[PDB]
């Protein structure tokens, strides 16, 4: 005669996955902005 609930922990691997690939997409975006700027000068 008894019952029980249950809780959950996230995976360690995940860690700060919010920025694991955010930093990387931000870095690529910076590269793309540099590309865009250089192309703007070249077109001019």
């Amino acid at each position: 005669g008894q019952q029980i609930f249950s809780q959950a922990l996230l995976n360690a691997n995940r860690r700060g996955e919010a920025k694991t690939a955010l930093a990387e997409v931000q870095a690529r975006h910076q590269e793309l902005l540099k590309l865009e700027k250089s192309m703007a000068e070249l077109t001019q």
């Binding site: 590269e31 793309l32 590309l35 250089s38 192309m39 000068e41 070249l42």
Partner: peptide
């Protein structure tokens, strides 16, 4: 690496066009 190569080519072409 492909994007860095593209950037390098664009910078070179900017130099040639300035010339």
């Amino acid at each position: 690496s492909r994007t860095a190569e593209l950037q390098a080519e664009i910078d070179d072409t900017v130099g040639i066009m300035r010339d």
